[PDB]
Design a protein around this nucleic acid. Structure first.
Ligand SMILES: [Mn+2]
Length: 690
DNA sequence: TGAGGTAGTAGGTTGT
RNA sequence: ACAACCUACUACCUC
């Protein structure tokens, strides 16, 4: 029962390897390719330099200024990068020659494993080479690939037609690219290209597939953790059994062989009105931390009744059930009456004219949480696009928070009612509503009801829960940035309180004019965050923990310069969502890999955290990478804070994987990119999004 | 859009 | 030309 990482480390060292360096007076790409094809040898290059493992015989002309047999100069990034590319190319060459592998699209194609009804399922692997303090580390990740067995000629010969708008891909080595000797005019971008209608195939994306295949493709590519680890380790051992440029231990995969130390964090305690072990047991039979009064206005459409046999009495009794479930936990909702003046509106013609029939709707829906019951076919169809327009109007302009409920919830709720024969007049009946609540607590739809209620709460300023124990840091900042088309969006979080008290957003614009965040907005973020912290606590914070989504491209000097005025310590921790590695615990009693939530592998100032416990059907747990940049606090504290801050998912009763500072910053960035949110100033729980 | 998870597909994005 | 990422869209899964 030992910890395993999908990495290896070499017994050799960077400066203990002998290489050949050629120096010429981009640059030498064509020279390197010529030498590679002439001398069938692994080579690599950089700006004006070439490196190889063995001497080159057929020099193929040219005048290399210098030729040396030497070791690496480890104090230069150039040489370390060139050596990393050298080992990467050497491993690729070894895998291609002695193993039947191909370089297909950023990975290495392997032996076919499955084929179902004109769909070919391959196996792929990817390798990364790093130099970490005079040591050579190699990380490997396993994936799959999809293809169609038939090219265009076979389909034409079978008397099929090819649409001008098809998705076309050409299989030529690593280049890949997507778009009777027919001439095909393919539009990659702007100018057209011509091809002989051969070696061009339609894509095998999930979008363009057809049923009876997707249900099996998904079943095939979602395999257990044990299989995913065992196949990868088997192929890696086969590759290393015939590689001679580096050596490794008999079992290079355990964390002991790497520079990794094991830590195990523990589940925090949540506080509603006492100390609770879990959020689930706190929502069920438990009050709320900061309740209040909410007024909710209902939105209805005729199409939800014309197409689907649901009447407004069902919607209103559902709302009454929600209100009394809410009052069972210390919050009261009252139905607004401004919507009673307008009856029969929001017809299908209204949905085809959503733009010009919302100007007179603002006065009746103001100062309320607007529940919406629009039809999904209207929500998704491009002609109607009810969801996008509804959000961009309500939240985008009038700053009104809304929650959408589609049919599937409604008939799922009605099916159990019809099963037990409860369908009857159940309005303002305490016993009938009590038995409805009792029969709603015996199935998974209770979680749907609770998710809807939590969304309503957080949209109406209710603060569901907090952490029982204060974290090692006073307050947290969360940053996320998204790039779509030209413009970029920024999502921010100011978690005020060592337990989580103001999970509100940053009352600032996130629409970045430039490519990234400028220092001027970075200043204001923490400036008004500290001001809000003092406004809500009357005390300045001793330490502020910053979380960044991705890599910190901003300047380190600005944070120190602005936080030295108030004499506050900080951190610049980075969080990476795709580590491209796996974490496992192997059991020697019976060959099996498993995973345990709250596991940390640490080395220097870099750690791998396991924050989820997925089932076998879902797949395998996906680690998360923590890179602590600043040195102020002990790094065992930052990891624990990151793990603890991921239990403040006040919008759902499902365990979020990311911390609350980045998992909501992402949502804010998406809402700003599409325009479904506007800045709001206040001191309360403010999450207009989910 | 009840919410979350994970595993395919494609195209951006710095930065040396 | 490489690296690291990040994002979108579909898909099954559990609550
Ligand atoms: Mn929601």
């Amino acid at each position: 029962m030992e910890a395993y990482i999908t990495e290896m480390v070499s017994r050799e060292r960077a400066n203990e390897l002998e290489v050949y360096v050629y120096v010429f007076p981009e640059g030498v790409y064509h020279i390197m390719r010529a030498w590679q094809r002439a001398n069938d040898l692994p080579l690599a290059y950089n700006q004006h330099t070439i490196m190889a493992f063995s001497p080159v015989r057929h020099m193929c002309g040219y005048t290399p200024m210098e030729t040396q047999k030497r070791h690496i100069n480890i104090d230069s990034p150039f040489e370390r990068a060139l050596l990393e590319r050298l080992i990467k190319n050497s491993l690729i060459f070894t895998a291609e020659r002695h193993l039947h592998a191909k370089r297909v699209g950023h990975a290495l194609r392997l032996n076919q494993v499955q084929q179902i009804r004109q769909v070919i399922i391959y196996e792929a692997i990817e390798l990364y080479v790093n130099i970490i303090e005079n040591r050579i580390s190699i990380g490997f990740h396993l994936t799959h690939q999809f293809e169609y067995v038939y090219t265009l000629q076979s389909m034409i010969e079978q008397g099929k037609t090819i649409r001008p708008g098809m998705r076309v891909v050409h299989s030529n080595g690593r280049q890949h690219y997507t778009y009777s000797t027919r001439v095909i005019h393919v539009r990659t971008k702007e100018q057209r290209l011509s091809y002989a209608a051969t070696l061009l195939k339609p894509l095998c994306t999930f979008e363009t597939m057809q049923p009876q295949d997707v249900l099996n493709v998904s079943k095939c590519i979602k395999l257990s953790a044990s299989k995913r680890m065992k196949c990868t380790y088997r192929w890696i051992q086969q590759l290393r059994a015939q590689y001679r440029h580096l050596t490794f231990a008999p079992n290079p995969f355990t964390i002991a062989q790497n520079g990794y130390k094991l830590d195990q964090l523990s589940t925090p305690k949540v506080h509603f009105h006492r100390d609770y072990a879990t959020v689930v047991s706190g929502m069920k039979t438990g009050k709320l931390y900061k309740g209040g009064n909410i007024k909710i206005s209902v939105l209805f459409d005729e199409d939800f009744y014309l197409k689907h046999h649901i009447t407004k009495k069902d919607i209103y009794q559902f709302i009454a059930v929600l209100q009394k479930i809410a009052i069972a936990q210390g919050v009261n909702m009252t139905i607004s009456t401004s919507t009673k003046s307008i009856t029969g509106k929001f017809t299908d013609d209204f949905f085809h004219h959503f733009t010009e029939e919302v100007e007179a709707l603002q006065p009746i829906f103001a100062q309320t949480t607007v529940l919406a019951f629009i039809t999904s076919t209207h929500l998704s169809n491009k002609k109607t696009r009810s969801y996008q327009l509804l959000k961009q109007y309500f939240g985008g302009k009038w700053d009104i928070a809304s929650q959408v409920i589609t049919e599937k919830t409604i008939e799922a709720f009605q099916k159990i009612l019809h099963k037990h024969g409860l369908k009857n007049f159940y309005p303002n009946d305490e016993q009938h509503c009590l038995r409805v609540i009792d029969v709603l607590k015996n199935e998974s739809f209770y979680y749907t009801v609770m998710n809807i209620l939590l969304g309503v709460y957080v949209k109406s300023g209710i603060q569901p829960w907090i952490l029982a124990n204060t974290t090692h840091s006073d307050c947290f900042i969360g940053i996320d940035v998204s790039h779509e088309n030209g413009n970029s969006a920024a999502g921010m979080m100011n978690v005020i309180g060592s337990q989580g008290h103001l999970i509100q957003q940053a009352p600032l614009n996130g629409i970045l004019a430039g490519e990234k965040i400028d220092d001027t907005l970075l200043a204001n973020l923490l400036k008004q965050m500290i001001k809000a912290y003092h406004t809500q606590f009357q005390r300045f914070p001793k330490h502020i923990t910053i979380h960044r989504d991705g890599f910190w491209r901003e300047h380190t000097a600005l944070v120190e310069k602005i936080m030295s005025h108030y004499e506050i310590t900080y951190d610049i921790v980075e969080i990476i969502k795709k580590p491209n590695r796996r974490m496992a615990f192997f059991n020697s009693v019976d060959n099996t890999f498993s995973t345990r939530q709250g596991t940390v592998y640490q080395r220097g100032n870099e750690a791998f955290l396991c924050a989820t416990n997925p089932q076998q059907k879902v797949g395998m747990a996906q680690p998360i990478k923590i890179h602590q940049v600043t040195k102020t606090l002990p790094f065992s504290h930052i990891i624990e804070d990151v793990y603890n801050l991921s239990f403040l998912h006040i919008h759902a009763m499902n365990k979020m994987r990311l911390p609350a500072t980045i998992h909501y910053a992402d949502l804010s960035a998406t809402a700003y990119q599409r325009g479904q949110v506007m800045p709001r100033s206040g001191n309360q729980t403010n999450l207009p999004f989910v």
